[PDB]
Amino acid sequence: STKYPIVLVHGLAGFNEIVGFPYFYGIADALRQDGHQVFTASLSAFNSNEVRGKQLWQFVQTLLQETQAKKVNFIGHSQGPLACRYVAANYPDSVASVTSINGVNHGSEIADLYRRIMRKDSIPEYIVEKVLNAFGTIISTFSGHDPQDAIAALESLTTEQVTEFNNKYPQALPKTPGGEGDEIVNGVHYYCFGSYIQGLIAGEKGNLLDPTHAAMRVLNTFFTEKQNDGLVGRSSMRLGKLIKDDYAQDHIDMVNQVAGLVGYNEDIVAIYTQHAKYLASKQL
Ligand SMILES: [Ca+2]
Ligand SMILES: [Ca+2]
């Protein structure tokens, strides 16, 4: 139904193999039921945004050859949107749209803290343990069974590193903190979705059986930005035209994880399928 194929983009190349199901849980399946052509680009987590960007460009080149489409519609999460922005900035004629879903568009405060912990920069022990136990719980839930090894993925998501990325690829970033960027830059459409953790944990419905959610709530308390999804602050997610960012969902919830266990009986998959129809309505 969309003119151009949809490319789902995320970091963690080994996710599907190690976890046993897709990063975007049930989302590609749902989009294909609505007649969209869908592909997933799983990029290398333990490296720079620019390296993921180059990875994604190679993926897109091969895909465009195989489809004879002239452009792609990117839908990225977390690391994904930065790689998408790299490709859009550098190869705008090959990108119809960039949609950012809880993208780390201006850095992650927990990544910042993680680096301070790793550098032993005067972080009190009780905070060190809370942060490391949270990440361990998240990793173990997905993998099945160390938490300091996660810095490999967060290294490229610090405020300092993303600020440097934004300096090189400023397209569609908001001019004011917590605002919106230009919808169309260099012929490419930019959209953003977001969320932040809300309410007391008792009312989270499906998430009560998801061990990652309590961990995200722990990480959430260490942000100076009070509205955050446990990994990124609400304002940091902003890119291009806002669609909606007040979902009561953590970072992991917004890709329908773990295995469909989300907050408040929200239909996360519907966020994606409705947006795909929205892209189609914009002649994309
Ligand atoms: Ca970078
Ligand atoms: Ca969840």
Contact present, 74 and 95 (Cβ < 8 Å): yes
The answer to whether 39 and 24 have CB atoms below 8 angstroms apart is no
Can you give the CATH number for the domain in which 69 is found?
3.40.50.1820
Taking the centre of ligand 1 as the mean of its atom positions, its distance from the CA of residue 128, in whole angstroms, is 25
Tell me how far the alpha carbon of residue 84 lies from the centroid of ligand 2, in angstroms. 25
**What is the structure's resolution, reported in angstroms to one decimal?**
2.0
Q: How far, in Å, from the CA of 163 to the mean position of ligand 2?
A: 29
- What single string gives the DSSP state of each residue in 34-52? TT--EEEEEE-SSS-HHHH
Q: What CA–CA distance (Å, rounded) separates 132 from 124?
A: 13
The tokens 């910042």 sit on which residue?
Answer: 112
**Is 229 one of the catalytic residues?**
yes
Rg (the chain; Cα; Å): 18
What's the CA gap between 98 and 87, in Å, rounded? 9
Crossing angle of helices 211-220 and 125-143, rounded to 10°: 150
How many angstroms separate the CA atoms of 36 and 70, rounded?
16
Ligand 1 center to 171 CA (angstroms)? 15
For the chain, how long is the longest CA-to-CA vector? 56
Burial of 3: CB neighbours in 10 Å, binned 0-12, 13-18, 19+ = middle
Catalytic residue of the set 112, 229, 245, 250: 229
Cα 26 from Cα 94, distance rounded (Å)? 27
Q: Which residue has the tokens 């790299």?
A: 86
Question: Phi first, then psi: what are they for 278, rounded to 5°?
Answer: -65, -45
Measure the CA–CA gap between 282 and 284, rounded to whole angstroms.
5
Q: Binding site: which residues?
A: 50, 207, 210, 253, 257, 261
- Cα distance between residue 269 and residue 260, in whole Å: 9
* Catalytic status, residue 182: no
Q: How many domains does the chain have?
A: 1
Catalytic residue among 10, 36, 78, 156: 78
Parent domain of 96: 1-284
